[PDB]
Design a protein around this ligand. Structure first.
Ligand SMILES: O=C(O)c1ccnc2cc([C@@H](OCCN3CCC(F)(F)CC3)c3ccccc3Cl)[nH]c12
Ligand SMILES: [Mn+2]
Length: 309
């Protein structure tokens, strides 16, 4: 009945020598990590970049997420107007996020086990008797208020001890993003995610089957699920069988907007699924054509970008 957590994805703790070049390190761990779709990378203990976003002016209107919107398809009066719209600052969103989680679980936010949030999230996704609605500060461009990493673009002050992180190859602004093609000779910045408890992203792969790298700057963990690329067709077949028939004929780019599926359903159909809790200061790398999904344990701040090799 209750959710069965998938097996854990690989976690790498590179030494300072191995941490010199990201693409070199990802290329070496590839024989294992590409068989799990996702992997987690813990930087050395003394690698701690500062938070370089413009906090005072950081404002956004998050998207409203109804956890059980797909199950509800199986209409309500005045549908399409369920939730009033709120604009937040970073502070007011965190106050809302902490108040929501502490009130939902009736305990301090840091005392809620990650396994309980995970079990409750997937129960609410399939629940028709309880309509839980959360908000997600998703797809906030790093050009709006700056990246979470320090950037030497002469827009915000950089301290001498912070210049190492502005020049680091693990700075998401310094990842290679230019794909090779003939059209590139004839003729992208990171995105930010401000999460709260139960805010989520559904199953998808990246454009051009690209790699992606994800960094959690601060906050409560982000729970991930990943499927290796050799099982990509198996996942799409399970979707074709069990996803809502009204969305069956939709192209992949549109279907991926609502490809919500319990990982146990995929595992029951023979699809290998791996999980991880990405904590503050840790990287998550997704490999080409590796389907991934997840949700946030609480108030946190993430940065993500697609990169090419
Ligand atoms: O939230 C995280 O941590 C996280 C980690 C990894 N991948 C994702 C992907 C997303 C979301 O956007 C995907 C599509 N957009 C990607 C960025 C873009 F600029 F190209 C514009 C299109 C999303 C997807 C499905 C349902 C809800 C949400 Cl919110 N969130 C992720
Ligand atoms: Mn993604």
């Amino acid at each position: 009945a209750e959710f069965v957590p998938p097996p854990e994805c690989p976690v790498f703790e590179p030494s300072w020598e191995e941490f010199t070049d990201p693409l070199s390190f990802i290329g070496r761990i590839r024989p294992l990590a590409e068989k799990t779709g996702i992997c987690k990378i813990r930087p050395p203990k003394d690698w701690q970049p500062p938070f370089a976003c413009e906090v005072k002016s950081f404002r956004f209107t998050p998207r409203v997420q109804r956890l059980n919107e797909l199950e509800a398809m199986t209409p309500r009066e005045a549908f399409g107007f369920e939730q009033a719209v709120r604009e937040y600052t970073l502070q007011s969103f965190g106050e809302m996020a902490d108040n929501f989680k502490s009130d939902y679980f009736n305990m301090p936010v840091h005392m809620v086990p990650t396994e309980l949030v995970e079990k409750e999230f997937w129960r609410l996704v399939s629940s028709i008797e309880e309509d839980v609605i959360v908000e997600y500060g998703a797809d906030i461009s790093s050009k709006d208020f700056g990246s979470g990493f320090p950037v030497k673009d002469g827009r915000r002050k950089i301290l001498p001890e912070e210049e190492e992180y502005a020049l680091s190859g693990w700075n998401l602004n310094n990842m290679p993003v230019l794909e090779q093609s003939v059209l590139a000779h004839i003729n992208k910045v990171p995105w930010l995610y401000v999460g709260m408890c139960f805010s989520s992203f559904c199953w998808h792969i990246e454009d051009h089957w690209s790699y992606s790298i994800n960094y959690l700057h601060w906050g409560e963990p982000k729970t991930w699920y990943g499927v290796p690329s050799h099982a990509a067709e198996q996942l799409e077949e399970v979707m074709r069988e069990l996803a809502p028939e009204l969305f069956e004929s939709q192209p992949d780019l549109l279907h991926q907007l609502v490809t919500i599926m319990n990982p146990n359903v995929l595992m029951e159909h023979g699809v290998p699924v791996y999980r991880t809790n990405q904590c503050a200061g840790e990287f998550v790398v997704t490999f080409p054509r590796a389907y991934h999904s997840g949700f946030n344990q609480g108030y946190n701040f993430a940065e993500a970008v697609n990169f090419c090799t």
